[PDB]
Amino acid sequence: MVYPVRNKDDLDQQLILAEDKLVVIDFYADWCGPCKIIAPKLDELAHEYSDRVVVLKVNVDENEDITVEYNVNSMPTFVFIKGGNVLELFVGCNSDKLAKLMEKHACIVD
Amino acid sequence: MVYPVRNKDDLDQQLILAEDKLVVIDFYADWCGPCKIIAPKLDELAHEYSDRVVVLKVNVDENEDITVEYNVNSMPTFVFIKGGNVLELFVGCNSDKLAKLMEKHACIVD
Ligand SMILES: [Zn+2]
Ligand SMILES: [Zn+2]
Ligand SMILES: [Zn+2]
Ligand SMILES: [Zn+2]
């Protein structure tokens, strides 16, 4: 399952506890159609990769600070992180690419 | 000669332009003794096989994304690729094996 981020200090802690794991952060809002469509597949991947991947979820309406720090301008946006380093940024609704990007490292509103 | 990779999109383009050729990617860093020793022999082979083999070079300190995607954990590491497929992975400093592996398909830091 996908862990909601309450604030920047929550997220900063999660990034350190993730250790060597792949971290994937999903920026979403409740008013975003494409966000809702891809969300089941993201939860499916989180179970398949639970030993290797940590999956975080940032609600942009309550987290303006985290959104500005990651330069999020569109939704959905998935940031792939390992060791506090941003490896790759991915915007859009292709859930087949999302699943592929998750295995290699283990439509658009606003 | 050996072509430096600037990013993942650079590398992805190189993999397609290489066509049917053998591609060899060398993962290295400036702080890696064994990397520096084998490097002349790699350049020698690149000239001998210039019509058949494309030789790419990825600096791991500036390319965390490519390193994670190829699961690089040590140096030097040579990935042998043909058609976007990874045929073989080779870690270590034996330049005689490197030359042999190059002809069949045409010490350790971190
Ligand atoms: Zn569950
Ligand atoms: Zn030359
Ligand atoms: Zn990547
Ligand atoms: Zn082979």
Author numbering:
A (entry chain A), B (entry chain A): 1 to 106, 125 to 128
What's in the article?
TrxT is testis-specific and associates with the lampbrush loops of the Y chromosome. The second difference is related to the TrxT fold, which is composed of a highly conserved core and a variable C-terminal domain, with the latter being absent in most canonical Trxs. This extra domain is mostly unstructured, with a high ratio of negatively charged residues. In D. melanogaster, this C-terminal domain is attached to the protein core via a covalent link that stabilizes a closed conformation that partially covers the catalytic site. The regions connecting Gly107 to Asp111 and His120 to Cys125 were also traceable, but unfortunately the fragment connecting Asp111 to His120 and the last 26 amino acids were not visible in the density, which is also in agreement with the rapid motions and negative 15N–[1H] NOE values measured for these residues. Moreover, in the case of TrxT the crystals contain two TrxT molecules engaged with a symmetry-related neighbor stabilized through the coordination of a Zn atom (which was present in the crystallization condition). The zinc is bound between Asp65 and Glu69 from monomer A and His105 and Glu88 from monomer B [Supplementary Fig. S3(b)]. Overall, these results underline the hypothesis that the C-terminal domain shields the active site of TrxT and modulates its redox activity.
Thioredoxins (Trxs) are ubiquitous enzymes that regulate the redox state in cells. In Drosophila, there are two germline-specific Trxs, Deadhead (Dhd) and thioredoxin T (TrxT), that belong to the lethal(3)malignant brain tumor signature genes and to the ‘survival network’ of genes that mediate the cellular response to DNA damage. Trxs share a conserved catalytic motif, with two conserved cysteine residues embedded in a canonical fold consisting of five β-strands and four α-helices. Drosophila Dhd, TrxT and Trx-2 are intermediate between these two characteristic folds, displaying four α-helices (as in all Trx structures) but only four β-strands (β2–β5).
